[PDB]
C-alpha cells in the first residue's frame, strides 16, 4: 500500500509540495500530488510564472517533479489547486529536503512492511499511524522532527521501546532501521606541527610527544601518525563531535603549555574539523 506520507489526508493551504505532472491541456495542467497519496490536482495555465511566457514546454514537462505552492484547497469537491509563481527557490530547497526525508521514511517503512510479508494494506495505514505519524506528533512536525526521531532511533533504541510492535516486528524494524542510516565513521582530524625548541630542543619536542601519547582519551583515542619528524596528524575516531573536538584542543593546549616552560612556539597547520 501507498498512502499519505503524513497523518493528514489533504494538503493544507499555502504550503509547498513536490508534485509530478500527468498531462497538459489548454485550460491548465493536470498533476499528481505525490507527497499526499498520489491524488490528482490541476495547475492553471495562467498560474505558472509572472514573466512574458514563450515556451510552456520549458517550464513544466511531462514527467518531471517540481515544487508548487498550494493556492485554493476545498474539500466538498476536493479541487486541489496549485501554482508556481509564488515560489521562491529557498522554499524550493526546503521542499526538496523535506520530500526526500519523507521518501527515506517511506522507503524504510516499505522495507519493513514488505519484509514482514505484511500484505495487509489498511494494516499498513495502521503501521504508519502506530509508528510514523505518532513520531511526527512527538516532535509535532512532519519531516525534520521525524528525522530527529529516527536520528535517535538508529543510535539509541530507547524511543523505539515506546512502540507497540510484536516480537518479530522489532526484528525487521532493527534489520532495516540501522543498516540504512549510519555510515558516519566521523573522525576528528587536525594535522599539526609543534615547533618548540631550546638548547635541549630534542628533549623539548620529545617531552611534547610524551604528553601527546599519554594524554590519550579512552573511548576517543587521540592517536598520532608521523610522516616527517615534526609532522603528525592528531586523530580521534569518536562519533560525537562535541566531545572529540573539545578534548583534542584541550590535549593540544596542555601539550603546548607544559612545553611552554621551555620556549614553545607553535607552527599552526590545521583546525579541529570532523569529516
Amino acid at each position: 500500500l501507498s498512502c499519505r506520507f503524513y497523518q493528514h489526508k489533504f494538503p493544507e493551504v499555502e504550503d509547498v509540495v513536490m508534485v509530478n505532472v500527468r498531462s497538459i491541456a489548454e485550460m491548465g495542467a493536470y498533476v499528481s500530488l505525490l507527497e499526499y497519496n498520489n491524488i490528482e490536482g490541476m495547475i492553471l495555465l495562467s498560474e505558472l510564472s509572472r514573466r512574458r511566457i514563450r515556451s510552456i514546454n520549458k517550464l513544466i514537462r511531462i514527467g518531471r517533479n517540481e515544487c508548487v505552492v498550494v493556492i485554493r484547497v476545498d474539500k466538498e469537491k476536493g479541487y486541489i489547486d496549485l501554482s508556481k509563481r509564488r515560489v521562491s527557490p529557498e522554499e524550493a530547497i526546503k521542499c526538496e529536503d523535506k520530500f526526500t526525508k519523507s521518501k527515506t521514511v517511506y522507503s524504510i517503512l516499505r522495507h519493513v512492511a514488505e519484509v514482514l510479508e505484511y500484505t495487509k494494506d489498511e494494516q499498513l495505514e495502521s503501521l504508519f499511524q502506530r509508528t510514523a505519524w505518532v513520531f511526527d506528533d512527538k516532535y509535532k512536525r512532519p519531516g525534520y522532527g521525524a528525522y530527529d526521531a529516527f536520528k535517535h532511533a538508529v543510535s539509541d533504541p530507547s524511543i523505539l521501546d515506546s512502540l507497540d510492535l510484536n516480537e518479530d516486528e522489532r526484528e525487521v524494524l532493527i534489520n532495516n532501521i540501522n543498516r540504512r542510516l549510519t555510515p558516519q565513521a566521523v573522525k576528528i582530524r587536525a594535522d599539526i606541527e609543534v615547533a618548540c625548541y631550546g638548547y635541549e630542543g630534542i628533549d623539548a619536542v620529545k617531552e611534547a610527544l610524551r604528553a601527546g601519547l599519554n594524554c590519550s582519551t579512552e573511548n576517543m583515542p587521540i592517536k598520532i601518525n608521523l610522516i616527517a619528524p615534526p609532522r603528525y596528524v592528531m586523530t580521534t575516531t569518536t562519533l560525537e563531535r562535541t566531545e572529540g573536538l573539545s578534548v583534542l584542543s584541550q590535549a593540544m593546549a596542555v601539550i603546548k603549555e607544559k612545553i611552554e616552560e621551555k620556549r614553545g612556539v607553535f607552527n599552526v597547520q590545521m583546525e579541529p574539523k570532523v569529516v
Binding site: 606541527e193 615547533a195 618548540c196 625548541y197 638548547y199 635541549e200 630542543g201 630534542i202 619536542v205 616527517a228 619528524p229 615534526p230 609532522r231 607552527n267
Partner: protein, 356 residues
C-alpha cells in the same frame, strides 16, 4: 672486496647548460641529484647536488644555467676537486666554464681534468675545432694543463680507462687535521665533508652561525647530534671529500627548506666567532667575467660554506673593505674567500682574498 669507508673525494661536474653534466655525474655515482620538482621539469639543477659511489667517491653536480651559478660557486669553495665535461654541442660551451675556471685559479685548485663527453653525437670536424678552441681557451688560465679524454658517460663506453686515468691524475688530497674541527652543512638531513677533527653520534655539537633571532643579534647555537651519516648511509667516522650526513638537535621544521643551509658546524666546546664585520685583503679582476672602482655602501657577495651574504661598505680602499651583514655569518678563523658583486640582476665574481 671494497671497504665501506667515508668518502675521500668530492668531484665537481661543470659545463654549459644542458650539455649533459648531470647525466655524467649520475653515470659516475649511480644516484639522482635532482631533488626538486621544478628542477626535474625544467631539466636544470636548482640546488647543490650530491651522490655517492665506492671507488669511496662522490660527484658534485653543478648547474649549467647562467642564473644558478652563484650557489655552485659557493659549493665549489667547499669542494676538493672538479671535472670539466665538454660536450659535443659547441666549441665555445657558454662563458661559465671559463668563469668557474678563473674562480678555481683564485681558489688554487690547479689539478683539473677535461672530459670530452658526447663524442658519438658530434662530428670529427667539431672535435678538431674544439681541439683548437680548447688550446686557445685553456691557455693563460688554470685549465691549460688539463688532459682531454673522450668518453660517453651515458652509454658507458671506455669507463674503466676513465676511472684509472682520473684516479691516477686527480688524486685525493690528505686533510689539515691540526686546525679547529669543522663540518660543513649544505642543506636542511644536512650534507657535507668533515674537514678536521671528529664528531660522534650523541655528542654535543654546534652550528657556528646559529640563528638571527626575530638590535637583533645572533648567539652561536650549541646542540647535539641525533645521528651520524655519510650521504644516506651511517658510518663511524668521516674524512674530507664527499657528502656526509650530519644530524642535529634542531627541529626539522625549523631547518626546513634550507633554512640552516650555508652555516658551518663544529663541536659545542669549540669557540667560533660570530661576527657582523670582517676585514679581507683583496685584489680585483681585469674584465667582467659574468657576461657571455668599488665604492662605499655597496652590497657584495662573500661565499663561505654554502652561504652567500651581503654587507655594507662603510669605507673602501684598494685592498680592504668592512661590511655589516643583514644576518650574521660565523668566522671562526682566517681562511679563503672569493668575492662577487651583483650587477644587472646577476651575481658576478669581481675578485678574491683572505680574511686576516
Amino acid at each position: 672486496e671494497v671497504i665501506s669507508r667515508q668518502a675521500t673525494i668530492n668531484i665537481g661536474t661543470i659545463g654549459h647548460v644542458a650539455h649533459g653534466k648531470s647525466t655524467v655525474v649520475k653515470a659516475i655515482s649511480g644516484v639522482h641529484t635532482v631533488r626538486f620538482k621544478n628542477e626535474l621539469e625544467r631539466n636544470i639543477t636548482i640546488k647543490l647536488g650530491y651522490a655517492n659511489a665506492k671507488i669511496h667517491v662522490s660527484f658534485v653536480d653543478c648547474p649549467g644555467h647562467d642564473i644558478l651559478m652563484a650557489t655552485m660557486l659557493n659549493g665549489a669553495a667547499v669542494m676538493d676537486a672538479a671535472l670539466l665535461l665538454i660536450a659535443g654541442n659547441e666549441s665555445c660551451p657558454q662563458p661559465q666554464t671559463s668563469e668557474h675556471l678563473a674562480a678555481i685559479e683564485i681558489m688554487k685548485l690547479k689539478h683539473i681534468l677535461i672530459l670530452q663527453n658526447k663524442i658519438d653525437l658530434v662530428k670529427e670536424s667539431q672535435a678538431k675545432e674544439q681541439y683548437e678552441q680548447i688550446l686557445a681557451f685553456v691557455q693563460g688560465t688554470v685549465a691549460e694543463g688539463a688532459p682531454i679524454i673522450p668518453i660517453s658517460a651515458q652509454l658507458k663506453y671506455n669507463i674503466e680507462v676513465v676511472c684509472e686515468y682520473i684516479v691516477k691524475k686527480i688524486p685525493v688530497p690528505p686533510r689539515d687535521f691540526t686546525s679547529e674541527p669543522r663540518l660543513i652543512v649544505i642543506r636542511s638531513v644536512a650534507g657535507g665533508s668533515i674537514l678536521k677533527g671528529v664528531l660522534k653520534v650523541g655528542q654535543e655539537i654546534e652550528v657556528r652561525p646559529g640563528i638571527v633571532s626575530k638590535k637583533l643579534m645572533c648567539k652561536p647555537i650549541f646542540s647535539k647530534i641525533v645521528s651520524l651519516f655519510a650521504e644516506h648511509n651511517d658510518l663511524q667516522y668521516a674524512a674530507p671529500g664527499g657528502l656526509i650526513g650530519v644530524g642535529t638537535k634542531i627541529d626539522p621544521t625549523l631547518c626546513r627548506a634550507d633554512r640552516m643551509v650555508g652555516q658551518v658546524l663544529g663541536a659545542v666546546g669549540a669557540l667560533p666567532e660570530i661576527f657582523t664585520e670582517l676585514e679581507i685583503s683583496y685584489f680585483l679582476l681585469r674584465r667582467l667575467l659574468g657576461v657571455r672602482k668599488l665604492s662605499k655602501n655597496e652590497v657584495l657577495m662573500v661565499n663561505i660554506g654554502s652561504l652567500s651574504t651581503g654587507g655594507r661598505v662603510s669605507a673602501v680602499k684598494a685592498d680592504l673593505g668592512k661590511i655589516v651583514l643583514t644576518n650574521p655569518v660565523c668566522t671562526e678563523v682566517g681562511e679563503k674567500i672569493a668575492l662577487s658583486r651583483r650587477v644587472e640582476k646577476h651575481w658576478r665574481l669581481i675578485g678574491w682574498g683572505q680574511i686576516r
